[PDB]
Design an enzyme around this catalytic site. Structure first.
Site, PDB file in Angstrom:
ATOM      1  CG  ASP A 180      10.713   3.543 -40.231  1.00  0.00           C
ATOM      2  OD1 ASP A 180      10.927   2.441 -40.792  1.00  0.00           O
ATOM      3  OD2 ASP A 180      11.260   4.606 -40.571  1.00  0.00           O
ATOM      4  CB  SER A 215       8.648   2.554 -45.279  1.00  0.00           C
ATOM      5  OG  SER A 215       8.721   3.676 -46.158  1.00  0.00           O
ATOM      6  CB  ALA A 216      12.684   0.047 -46.998  1.00  0.00           C
ATOM      7  N   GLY A 217      10.302  -2.390 -47.251  1.00  0.00           N
ATOM      8  CA  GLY A 217      10.141  -3.804 -47.533  1.00  0.00           C
ATOM      9  C   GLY A 217      11.301  -4.693 -47.096  1.00  0.00           C
ATOM     10  CB  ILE A 218      14.493  -4.663 -46.129  1.00  0.00           C
ATOM     11  CG1 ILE A 218      14.770  -3.215 -45.703  1.00  0.00           C
ATOM     12  CG2 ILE A 218      14.527  -4.789 -47.620  1.00  0.00           C
ATOM     13  CD1 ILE A 218      16.248  -2.745 -46.077  1.00  0.00           C
ATOM     14  N   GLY A 219      12.755  -4.378 -43.310  1.00  0.00           N
ATOM     15  CA  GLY A 219      12.958  -4.443 -41.857  1.00  0.00           C
ATOM     16  C   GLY A 219      11.855  -5.166 -41.105  1.00  0.00           C
ATOM     17  CD  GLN A 261      15.408  -1.220 -42.668  1.00  0.00           C
ATOM     18  OE1 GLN A 261      14.198  -1.098 -42.447  1.00  0.00           O
ATOM     19  NE2 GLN A 261      16.110  -0.290 -43.288  1.00  0.00           N
TER      20      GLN A 261
END
EC number: 3.1.3.48
Length: 298
Positions: A180, A215-219, A261
């Site tokens: 992450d 987890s967030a779908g962006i990084g 990210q």
């Protein structure tokens, strides 16, 4: 040209500034649907929402909202669905989306537990004999086989629409060592995985868009798609110098906020594209080198 830009940025130590420049220039579009009170428990993170204009709509009249965005790369001729790690109440929605969008592959770049917290629901079956039924969307999901490698696993799943009893094979590509807010352990290891996904057909135009999530779908998810798109653009014209990574990233951020990210994820994206260019530009043997350097066995 990206390899000279990379050295110049590395030399001046200006990755943070380049990355902040991207954040400042990035698109801002409304996310009104994501922010409706009724959708509060469909979003994992308060500050990561799909834009209204590119959000994936579930084909149901109760509530069509899922935290998922269609990233439609016109020049590259590839589409991706980026989505958050499913929540305990949105796993049915997730597989409904996969069904309705005709996806063949799901790329998962996170672990269910990271840094001691739960980042994603256990949305797929871990044992062949313990299939899952999503009663809200009337879907059945069975584990058919898994191929465990040292840092990723590939699963063959069978997704069944219980209304019609149609079934489809879904491939699940699970990257298990990518932290992450971190980067993969090496370009070779990232690229070996990406080309495993490509080989499967999951990114191909005869299927619906691959579903990619962390987890967030962006990084991590953005890093995966950015590298893939840049390599495809380079491939289409055999012209590495024509690929402007930052512009590609800004293009992607028209479709979902926040892609990439950290500045080190941006830097890694350059490394992955630069190294991948060796394969694109005709050194087929580099694919075997990546597989070796990635130590996927065991």
């Amino acid at each position: 040209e990206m390899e000279k830009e990379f050295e110049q940025i590395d030399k001046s130590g200006s990755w943070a500034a380049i990355y902040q420049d991207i954040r400042h220039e990035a698109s801002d579009f409304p996310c009104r649907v994501a922010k409706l009170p009724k959708n509060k428990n469909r979003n994992r993170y308060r500050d990561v929402s799909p834009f209204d204009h590119s959000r994936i709509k579930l084909h149901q009249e109760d509530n069509d909202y899922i935290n998922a965005s269609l990233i439609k790369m016109e020049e590259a001729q590839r589409s991706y669905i980026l989505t958050q790690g499913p929540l305990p109440n949105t796993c049915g929605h997730f597989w409904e989306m996969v069904w309705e969008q005709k996806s063949r592959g799901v790329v998962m770049l996170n672990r269910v537990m990271e840094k001691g917290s739960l980042k994603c629901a256990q949305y797929w079956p871990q044992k062949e004999e313990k299939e899952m039924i999503f009663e809200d969307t009337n879907l059945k999901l069975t584990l058919i086989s898994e191929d465990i490698k040292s840092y990723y696993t590939v699963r063959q799943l069978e997704l069944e629409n219980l209304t019609t009893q149609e079934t489809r094979e879904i491939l699940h590509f699970h990257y298990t060592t990518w932290p992450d807010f971190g980067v993969p352990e090496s370009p070779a290891s990232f690229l070996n995985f990406l080309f495993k996904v490509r080989e499967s057909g999951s990114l191909s135009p005869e299927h619906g868009p691959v579903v990619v999530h962390c987890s967030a779908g962006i990084g991590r998810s953005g890093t995966f798609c950015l590298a893939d798109t840049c390599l495809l653009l380079m491939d289409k014209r055999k012209d590495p110098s024509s690929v402007d990574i930052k512009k590609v990233l800004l293009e992607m951020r028209k479709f979902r906020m926040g892609l990439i990210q950290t500045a080190d994820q941006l830097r890694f994206s350059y490394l992955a594209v630069i190294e991948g260019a060796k394969f694109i530009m005709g050194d087929s043997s580099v694919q075997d080198q990546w597989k070796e350097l990635s130590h996927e066995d065991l």
